[PDB]
Design a protein around this ligand. Structure first.
Ligand SMILES: Cc1cc2nc3c(=O)[nH]c(=O)nc-3n(C[C@H](O)[C@H](O)[C@H](O)COP(=O)(O)OP(=O)(O)OC[C@H]3O[C@@H](n4cnc5c(N)ncnc54)[C@H](O)[C@@H]3O)c2cc1C
Ligand SMILES: Cc1cc2nc3c(=O)[nH]c(=O)nc-3n(C[C@H](O)[C@H](O)[C@H](O)COP(=O)(O)OP(=O)(O)OC[C@H]3O[C@@H](n4cnc5c(N)ncnc54)[C@H](O)[C@@H]3O)c2cc1C
Ligand SMILES: CN1CCN(C(=O)c2ccc3cc[nH]c3c2)CC1
Ligand SMILES: CN1CCN(C(=O)c2ccc3cc[nH]c3c2)CC1
Lengths: 588, 588
């Protein structure tokens, strides 16, 4: 057991020192490596449960049982005297840089997971390259380093959501005594986009600075894995070349899908285009019903746009459908129109986009409802949000031998290993995992530590909390009510629930009984909390802390014995008592 | 064991039915009690794991071992045949109303704790009276039912905090693209006060409706306990009379203190007056440094006032002092002035309050700094926030025998019992307990269930979370860092910390490294989280959910394995790594 861990660590680590905190011979070697600017991992044996067994096991590689012992890429280098011999003779730098490969690690993809993996690996002395290339959208949109979340995802969408939230802050301010007249204030799209894009630009630059200061090689090039250790790269001049790496991490993410109908690619756009669009979209149609579709429709309506959402079947498929229906009902009462049970058939162009005068075009959308009836209406902008997919045929030659699933995602072990032993996959392309930015970052950092610092900790993908940033936000952690009932049976499920009203909404004359929360619990397991759900302002801040308690196995009694903080929205979770089975109203 | 519980339950329940869910004779008795509008507690013997022992023990009271058994105020009334006999002979109503006392429960004080206890007790058939009287302030201010939080505490102060927060929302809206000009907008104090007071009035009315609908007698009269079971009452016509009760709950709260200096009572005010003041306070001095002092100074400054705070020694004595200093530094950078190490000596009147034109007066304040230098400045309003105190001599004759501590608070057992066996105390007057509204509510409800429904659950007063609603909010749960070190020693404490920047602050050009959070952990107990601290927006929403995890004994490893929600402020708690011992900077 211990023997197999130590073998794996020695073979994989780039530069690793086995040391003790008390030893001055170890302090002597650490200081030498620091002066020579040699980064390395360190294992302190006097601080591990079974460091005494490891010390004896090191002898199988070095034939000595003492400390310090320094290894490079699986090879024993020497003890104190020998390392200082190499340093005094100017032989050290050459020894620590000898490798069968150009790099200890090549990361294909410079997004959430890839940048986190590459930076963490470099901390332990791995010689690392990060490759990133942004294939342009059909109308030619492109952006800088950092991936989907930074450039065309979580960051710009939450900034535009905040711009939408401030419209109701302006309305509320009158009732709290401020002298403004909300009816005479308007919004400027391009001023918003300029501020959002300036922030994104500071993140692009910050990542390039971060990589340089960690001695990571950044190549703005398209990568393709052609054999287990060879990556073919193509740069901006279509210069093709080949680099080699010991370990490979695939982290290339996904892009938006388009439906197979006339005019979609030619005349519609996706979220990839929306966040840097140089003109206001105007009267807009959003096709789809995912969290992307609803978040974008929501802030466009709050900025004063004429917005319609066309829904094929249900909202937020895969989320709790009671909460999804409450989300949509709020949006419809606050100025989002819905075309329900409806799909598109074709998009026709009536006016070309006026790139000169900074104006949208004009389009005719034709479709049909699910019973047979027809749809026909004109829009200035049409946004498709009908899912996202990887395209690993661009990234990965089928001869390498990496197994994909029926959706095109990489099949991995619980330590992110593919069917090719030195190749790993993280983030949205890892089959079956939640497609979220903090998941990708944790997977990447934790993997880098296992490869290059002898760590053993795995990423836990269960009960990962989420928030949908619709105009009224929806936070969740754990099972939906319908999934719990299917898994355990209705007689074993108890649901506590309540409406609430934010104190901030009282003076502002907002709605009494639209905010809502529930706990879905398992009777036969001490009323264990299976799922937590909340619709209300600041829902992500409310939900986050409870995710720790659910990870630790919270019960209803744990929520009951904890005291609330007053006045807050969150405290309503500490005093829930109305059950669904009782039939008593949840209103306040 | 079981037998001592049953005896305590039977003696103090007002009306209680011992039952089993399966029994149709029990269902027949339940149906008769409902039809006669007789409220009662019910104990289902087949839902308790030692119901068989309880059933046998009942025979010691009734001479029978079957269910149903009905008891009234300690006396066995009958089985099924006997209860129905009383019903059809019109004898039952008189039996269930037989009492040595006017009431099963008298609550002295109609605030957070007292209202909660009274409503819960009435649910189990206790005949209940709630007494409430508001002694006017020195200038004559008074208010309605509901206590300090509802009328002159948490509720109005968080509403005026929200009005202050909206000033920076107006500022931020320009950077997100809205056309308003913040420099042309001003605030109207009386409009805000009118909206706050209309909400408070709806709460006053809602409580009177709730007591009527639970059949609780509300007396707007001052109460005085003159013997264990006798309460002397004085009404608004100064008519004096005496009522008797079996159990007594003391829940009379505290009122603000004044310093013993010339002019304080005559010319200054307290928070009791501020929340309904008919004119804007104008240039204001706040004397004191409690959370009340800083919260009030903070919103007055955000509403455009010229505000100074006079601090005797430190801010937020008893809270973590690193966090307290950050709170004050933020206020001082955003337009609160501070007179540090300074106390007042007298207040002189220069102008009387102008009640016609709705304007404050004018005052001269003289004081001194701790080195002896003099303070002298004019203000329109002086607010004293120098602590709160009970005055139980107005509530409690000394011959009753209820023990008080050195501060005048009631010394209680861990089930809220005083030194007089039928008298209990809850809320701010219970010595040693956190003085918070949700604590008083939990204590009151849990106590009512133990007195009248045979419950055993105690209130848990440890690790109760708090939030200070200063202009930048401060949330906490558990020990301060200096208390952790004093208790365990510096070598056993590790502190993880980080600055952060809300995403909402980026486009708005707010500060990079003012928001801050830390976890104070115990090394030798598996890195147990002893305390959590966060300075930032929505800090109460952030903190609440983590209080459940701390209640269950969370460690740093539990925070690490839980995944963040992105983008949120709260997620920074899931990835902390910089220790204070390392000396590495916490800036981001
Ligand atoms: C509109 C939208 C909103 C979102 N909002 C949230 C939110 O609020 N919270 C949240 O947690 N998640 C959110 N997400 C999801 C989040 O963006 C993703 O889960 C995350 O970005 C996935 O990270 P990744 O590292 O797997 O891939 P990515 O971040 O997509 O990075 C992959 C990178 O590799 C590049 N690449 C691809 N092929 C190659 C190649 N052959 N060679 C070189 N480089 C290549 C890609 O162009 C890209 O730059 C949102 C997503 C979208 C689309
Ligand atoms: C400015 C301010 C802000 C606060 N903010 C918060 C906050 O954000 N969160 C929080 O949790 N707590 C807050 N508190 C504390 C909270 O108000 C108290 O902890 C809570 O109200 C205590 O409730 P209680 O039932 O003990 O007493 P109270 O709510 O004070 O009720 C006691 C009642 O009994 C009445 N009474 C007194 N003597 C008699 C008598 N002889 N006969 C009859 N009736 C009598 C009193 O007039 C009063 O109506 C704040 C307090 C202040 C002053
Ligand atoms: C009765 N039937 C139709 C509603 N429903 C939805 O999925 C739904 C809910 C709300 C909104 C708001 C806009 N679109 C919506 C669709 C399923 C149940
Ligand atoms: C050395 N001493 C300096 C003062 N200090 C405080 O506790 C404090 C007091 C008052 C204000 C007002 C704004 N920030 C403040 C900090 C730290 C300890």
């Amino acid at each position: 057991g211990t023997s197999q861990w130590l073998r794996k660590t020695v073979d994989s680590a780039a530069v690793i020192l086995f040391s003790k905190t008390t030893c001055p011979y170890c302090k002597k070697v650490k200081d030498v490596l620091a002066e020579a600017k040699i980064k390395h991992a360190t294992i302190e044996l006097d601080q591990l449960s079974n460091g005494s067994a490891i010390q004896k096991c090191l002898a199988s590689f070095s034939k000595i049982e003492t400390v310090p012992q320094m290894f490079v890429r699986g090879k024993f280098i020497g003890d104190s005297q020998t390392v200082l011999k190499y340093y005094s003779n100017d032989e050290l730098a050459g020894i620590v840089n000898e490798s069968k490969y150009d790099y200890d690690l090549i990361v294909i993809g410079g997004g959430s997971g890839g940048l986190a993996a590459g930076k963490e690996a470099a901390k332990y002395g791995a010689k690392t390259a990060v490759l990133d290339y942004v294939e342009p959208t059909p109308i030619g949109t492109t952006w800088g380093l950092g991936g989907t979340c930074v450039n065309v995802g979580c960051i710009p969408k939450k900034l535009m959501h905040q711009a939408g939230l401030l419209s109701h802050a302006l309305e509320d301010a009158e009732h709290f005594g401020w002298s403004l007249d909300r009816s005479k204030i308007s919004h400027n799209w391009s001023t918003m986009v300029e501020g959002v894009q300036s922030h994104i630009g500071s993140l692009n630059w910050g990542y390039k600075v971060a990589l340089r200061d960690n001695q990571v090689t950044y190549l703005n090039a398209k990568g393709r894995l052609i054999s287990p250790h060879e990556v073919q790269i193509t740069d901006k001049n279509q210069k093709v070349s080949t680099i080699t790496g010991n370990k490979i991490i695939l982290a290339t993410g996904e892009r938006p899908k388009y439906p197979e109908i006339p005019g979609a690619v030619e005349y519609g756009i996706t979220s990839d285009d929306l966040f840097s669009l140089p003109y206001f979209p105007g009267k807009t149609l959003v096709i789809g019903a995912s969290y992307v579709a609803l978040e974008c429709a929501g802030f466009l309506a709050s900025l004063g746009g004429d917005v319609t959402v066309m829904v094929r079947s249900i909202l937020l498929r895969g989320f709790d459908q009671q909460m999804a229906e409450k989300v949509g009902d709020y949006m419809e009462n606050h100025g989002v129109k819905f075309a329900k049970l409806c799909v598109p058939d074709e998009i026709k162009q009536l006016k070309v986009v006026d790139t000169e005068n900074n104006k949208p075009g004009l389009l005719l959308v034709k479709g049909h409802y699910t019973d047979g009836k027809k749809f026909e209406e004109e829009f200035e902008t049409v946004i498709f949000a009908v899912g996202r997919e990887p395209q690993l045929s661009k990234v990965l030659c089928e001869t390498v031998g990496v197994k994909l699933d029926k959706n095109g995602r990489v099949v991995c072990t619980d330590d992110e290993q593919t069917t090719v032993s030195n190749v790993y996959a993280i983030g949205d392309i890892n089959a079956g995992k939640p497609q979220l930015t903090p998941v990708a970052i944790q997977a990447g950092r934790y993997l880098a530590r296992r490869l290059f610092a002898g760590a053993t900790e795995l990423t836990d993908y269960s009960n990962v909390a989420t928030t949908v940033f619709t105009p009224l936000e929806y936070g969740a952690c754990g099972l939906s009510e319908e999934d719990a009932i299917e898994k355990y049976g209705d007689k074993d499920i108890e649901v506590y629930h309540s409406n609430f009203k934010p104190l901030e909404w009282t003076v502002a004359h907002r709605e009494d009984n639209v905010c809502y929360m529930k706990l879905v619990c398992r009777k036969s397991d001490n009323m264990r909390v299976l799922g937590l759900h909340v619709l209300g302002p600041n829902a992500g801040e409310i939900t986050q802390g409870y995710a720790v308690a659910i990870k630790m196995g919270a019960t209803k009694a744990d929520f009951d014995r904890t005291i609330g903080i007053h006045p807050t929205c969150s405290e309503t979770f500490t005093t829930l008592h109305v059950t669904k089975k009782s039939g008593v109203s949840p209103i306040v």
